[PDB]
Design a binder for this molecule. Sequence first.
Ligand SMILES: CC(C)CCC[C@@H](C)[C@H]1CC[C@H]2[C@@H]3CC=C4C[C@@H](OC(=O)CCC(=O)O)CC[C@]4(C)[C@H]3CC[C@]12C
Ligand SMILES: CC(C)CCC[C@@H](C)[C@H]1CC[C@H]2[C@@H]3CC=C4C[C@@H](OC(=O)CCC(=O)O)CC[C@]4(C)[C@H]3CC[C@]12C
Ligand SMILES: CC(C)CCC[C@@H](C)[C@H]1CC[C@H]2[C@@H]3CC=C4C[C@@H](OC(=O)CCC(=O)O)CC[C@]4(C)[C@H]3CC[C@]12C
Ligand SMILES: O=C1NO[C@H]2[C@@H]1CN[C@@H]2C(=O)O
Ligand SMILES: O=C1NO[C@H]2[C@@H]1CN[C@@H]2C(=O)O
Ligand SMILES: O=C1NO[C@H]2[C@@H]1CN[C@@H]2C(=O)O
Lengths: 430, 430, 430
Amino acid sequence: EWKRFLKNNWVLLSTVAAVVLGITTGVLVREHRNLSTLEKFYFAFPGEILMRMLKLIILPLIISSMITGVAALDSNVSGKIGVRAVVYYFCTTLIAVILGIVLVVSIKPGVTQVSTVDAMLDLIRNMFPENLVQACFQQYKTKREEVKPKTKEYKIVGMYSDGINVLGLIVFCLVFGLVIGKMGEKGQILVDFFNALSDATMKIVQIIMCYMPLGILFLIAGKIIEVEDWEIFRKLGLYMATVLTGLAIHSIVILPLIYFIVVRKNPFRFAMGMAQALLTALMISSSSATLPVTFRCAEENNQVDKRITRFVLPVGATINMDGTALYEAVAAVFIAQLNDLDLGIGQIITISITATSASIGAAGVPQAGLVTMVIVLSAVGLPAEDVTLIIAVDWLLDRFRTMVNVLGDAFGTGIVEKLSKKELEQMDVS
Amino acid sequence: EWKRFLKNNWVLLSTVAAVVLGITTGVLVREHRNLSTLEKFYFAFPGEILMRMLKLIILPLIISSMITGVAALDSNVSGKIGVRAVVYYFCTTLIAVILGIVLVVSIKPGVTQVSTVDAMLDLIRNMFPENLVQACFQQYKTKREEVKPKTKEYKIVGMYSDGINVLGLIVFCLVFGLVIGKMGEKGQILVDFFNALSDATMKIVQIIMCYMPLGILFLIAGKIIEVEDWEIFRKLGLYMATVLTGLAIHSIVILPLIYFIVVRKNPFRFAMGMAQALLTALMISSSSATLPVTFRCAEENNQVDKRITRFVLPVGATINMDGTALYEAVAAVFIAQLNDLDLGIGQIITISITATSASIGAAGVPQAGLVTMVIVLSAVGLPAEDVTLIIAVDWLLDRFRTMVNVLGDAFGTGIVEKLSKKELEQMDVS
Amino acid sequence: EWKRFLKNNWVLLSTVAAVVLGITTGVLVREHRNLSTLEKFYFAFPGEILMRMLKLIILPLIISSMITGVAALDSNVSGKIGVRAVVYYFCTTLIAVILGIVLVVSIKPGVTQVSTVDAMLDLIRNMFPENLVQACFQQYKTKREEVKPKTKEYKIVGMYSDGINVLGLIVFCLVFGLVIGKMGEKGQILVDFFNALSDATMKIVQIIMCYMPLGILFLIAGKIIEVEDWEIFRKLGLYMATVLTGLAIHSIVILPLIYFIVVRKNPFRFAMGMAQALLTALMISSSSATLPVTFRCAEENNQVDKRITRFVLPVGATINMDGTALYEAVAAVFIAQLNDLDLGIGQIITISITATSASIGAAGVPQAGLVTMVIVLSAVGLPAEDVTLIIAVDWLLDRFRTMVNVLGDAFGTGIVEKLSKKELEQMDVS
Ligand SMILES: CC(C)CCC[C@@H](C)[C@H]1CC[C@H]2[C@@H]3CC=C4C[C@@H](OC(=O)CCC(=O)O)CC[C@]4(C)[C@H]3CC[C@]12C
Ligand SMILES: CC(C)CCC[C@@H](C)[C@H]1CC[C@H]2[C@@H]3CC=C4C[C@@H](OC(=O)CCC(=O)O)CC[C@]4(C)[C@H]3CC[C@]12C
Ligand SMILES: CC(C)CCC[C@@H](C)[C@H]1CC[C@H]2[C@@H]3CC=C4C[C@@H](OC(=O)CCC(=O)O)CC[C@]4(C)[C@H]3CC[C@]12C
Ligand SMILES: O=C1NO[C@H]2[C@@H]1CN[C@@H]2C(=O)O
Ligand SMILES: O=C1NO[C@H]2[C@@H]1CN[C@@H]2C(=O)O
Ligand SMILES: O=C1NO[C@H]2[C@@H]1CN[C@@H]2C(=O)O
């Protein structure tokens, strides 16, 4: 069974082979020939074509994915189980993002061993853009300029700079999907159009991901050619330790705390009841393929009713992703600290809004998370070409992210069950 | 019946409350604290967000509205009643626009107490843009530059400046809707797509209009803070007098003159026959909700046949709007004169084309006329932030505009009846 | 039968009348009044409006045409006859384009009697653009800039210049149409949407072509006003001789050579068997209206089976166009040589890719070839206003282009028949 194993596990095997070949190619080139500044640019050309192909696809991706995601989410929510589950999902995703931001600006991996009033208003000025086609490639920014005729008086001058406006497209696609999801039959052709557009965009993303290992091979070789000291391995170790301690103090402290405030039972017996689901999510790395095991572990081991589980588990396997959100926040601030920049209070809120509302805008596909890392890094303006320092270590943390996601919706069943008990009686008598 | 009256009349009541609160807030701020140049900009920030939200929505609005409007108008016109009614509607709308422009440049409310050959060719150069995506945000303009090697010889240099091209989008959406309205079954998916897009855009415009009174509150407070002399109240009085004398000499002189040229009967007995329809259009301010009363007043009081009324009245309640067109022309030139600019012969024809062809491109909705005032002011390049000086007095003239619209299509039934009498005999014998 | 002949042949008659009237108008103006530099620009204004209308329509044209063309081509190919016929079509179109480029840079009609490494990488950088809305109006270009701190070291700086990116739109529409053609039922609304969009775009192109003769009248008058010497008639004669010798050595030498390598029979008896089809394609100038005659001449005169002819002939009448591809390559390099420019090795490959993949992207319509000449001239950045020097002589070469196309797919039936004989036996026994 040699060819079947290659056909089953092509993604992880080809990523690992690309990283190994890129490291040994950069080592064998660095110890055989020097390279000038110009021929260090022609050597990292397939990585440049990959970074162009990844930024090509995010503009149909966020539009189609946000519209169909919030339309299907408006369709799935029916009564009072739906609103409670959705409020729970977005509160825990926001708590995970805030925990990740706090941990990465406190530990600071990557650093070497103005007026905030204007930035927090350019945020709201970028949520409502003045043009919907210019929001696809250019952003707004205001500066304070002094005026000339005893006191010092200024005024505010705004201008449009280059780079895509992700907040404006996210907010307009949210409002547009909520509008066409509520029109009923008169707006079904729009929902079908954007559903087919989302499926076509995910197929093109799969084609780009089939190209990807050649690009990351030449990118990793071009990274380790110019590296002279063994310093960035320490920064990658600290980044992996930051993501792992974020998932550790999110699955152990915060989510049992929420279960103890709401349900007021013992959360650790509940976590011990779901052992086989977490073991399966460690073994196979999908939250949707772990689903029958967590149905079995929440239904017959824990005393959770089936009528609530049937809604909370299959919907929470696709829009409740806490570990991926913590990962994307920590990785975006790590790439920002690696390039010797400083994030303000506008770029941190743009990271925290883009990473929260990307559970909707990833279409529930495992082979798209890299593209989400290009969205967040293009939501604030960072160079995306350091993304190749995260794909090298992604296969070490993917399983732990899956475990944190599955533990999130597994706790969510019990929390939503204890939160609303009147509706089960109302549906049990009639 | 206190809450039902609030649920019925929320628009007018909330606009009036916003104007009153903005005036008393600006008075109580102006007599308690001075404001610098910078903190006069942070105080008028919700108005800036409202003026961004209003300019966000006009680009899907004019595309969807013009395409579905001219497609449904091509569908409604069947024989020779249709062409006569449509030619009548657009001739009277053009006459009302020309009368409004003449009255506002003769009275001149707002003023304080080049080469036209190139501009009239940049008009035609902007009706056919060189790119269809750049027409969504940028315009063309030619200047005359002297050439250097006995006579003085020049040449022409063109460049693209910023701001949306409304004429190019209007002309291309006219041609595109006429094309897909005539393709039959092969172009029905496009008609359904743009119909659903138009309905979604009108729902988002209703959301923006639900936000609107907070924005106009802070805009009116920011207007009357910086005002030192009681001069702009005189200009608002002259603007209201200009709109009222435009509607007065359009409903009394011009439309009975057209009825006397075409029909050669007495128009004033015809106007006295439609008294209850005009009284209802004064009472309730909708031209589509006044429709059964004008059916009754034209059918049984006047001797107008039913077979022509069934087509002229419900189609002319949505695309024949003379009072709104006169209003938008007068208000656009009033905002142009209030900012101490001068309109050429290119901007006046752009105002007269954008205001005429906005009866099609407003989708027949009462809660969208403000957005049309943002289109005309963005068709020529005027600052839209003086729109808040027109919403303060709009509820005084809305009922008179409704009366002029209803009188227009009420005269139109009799004019189209006397114009074509062969078709009624041809459909009466067979 | 005077009015029926005018209704049948309006295109050729109106083009010839426009050329004759433009020449006699330029002669009668040049010998009656001098014209300054400024009034030579107002005289060529309808041609400027025509050249704006032609560039307005190519952006929906290439998108809709490439998507529906490659989707319907993916649908038509079923077994092994389809792949063989498609590979044959694109190999012969590429051979015709290469022959046309070689002949026009060897003969050089139009001439008067950097680093290629960077250009051949900006080609691949423009095939994958960084933004999909900016690909509709702007292109990428890299230059080499020296760096300043013993050897001379440079770096590479890229920037976005104006003009549409045709390679990026062509490649993305190819991949998008291949994706939605393979999704089956889930992507049928996209195929129907782009089919209706393609039909509407071809109707608008027919409207523009109905305007066209007034524009080419004023363009030809403006051309021959400024001409002082009788030199450009010699260049037009050499251009017609270049296109005619390209079609001559493509129909006589190259295609019988391919038939002799593959089939190893006598190709000249095969060409003599199809005499009536070529005579009809000389008489009427359509490759789709010549189709029953070439069915009859290949079926009953030549010994070609019907089961292969039923697929090769009606599909090869619309996507196998060798003469039009040779024509567009020769005409693009002729317009480039007429304006005293020099084409690199990037612009020649952009011409050779845009002209090859425009058989798909012309929607199989005879009244669209002029628009394809605006695409190729806008794929490399040439001034399109010299297109009026090619429409004057197009009706002399259109019939010979039709003959070369028909000879191409007529040889293609026999080549694909001798190439695969196992499938006919497999479908004859079962
Ligand atoms: C580590 C600590 C700081 C975490 C604290 C988390 C809480 C702030 C969150 C987590 C889950 C939240 C709950 C999730 C779901 C709901 C249901 C929600 O229901 C509705 O909005 C009304 C539904 C209806 O009646 O229609 C009300 C808030 C509530 C109880 C939330 C209250 C706030 C909670 C407890
Ligand atoms: C104050 C004064 C200057 C106003 C003058 C207005 C006139 C110039 C307009 C108003 C209504 C117009 C009429 C409205 C409708 C028609 C039908 C229209 O019919 C057709 O186009 C043909 C229909 C067919 O036979 O198919 C011919 C012009 C006509 C009589 C118009 C002629 C010009 C009129 C009288
Ligand atoms: C003047 C000279 C230089 C012209 C040379 C032309 C050749 C390079 C081309 C012309 C037609 C081509 C053939 C057209 C079609 C096919 C079928 C094609 O079939 C497949 O790809 C496999 C189909 C399958 O098995 O599914 C293989 C190549 C082949 C023989 C091509 C081989 C190359 C050929 C002979
Ligand atoms: O549980 C998951 N399924 O798909 C996502 C998430 C973690 N692993 C995937 C990823 O983000 O790569
Ligand atoms: O009669 C009318 N119904 O709707 C329109 C028009 C006048 N009042 C509305 C407006 O334009 O605000
Ligand atoms: O055979 C042909 N039918 O349509 C095309 C091609 C040659 N003549 C047309 C053209 O390109 O103009």
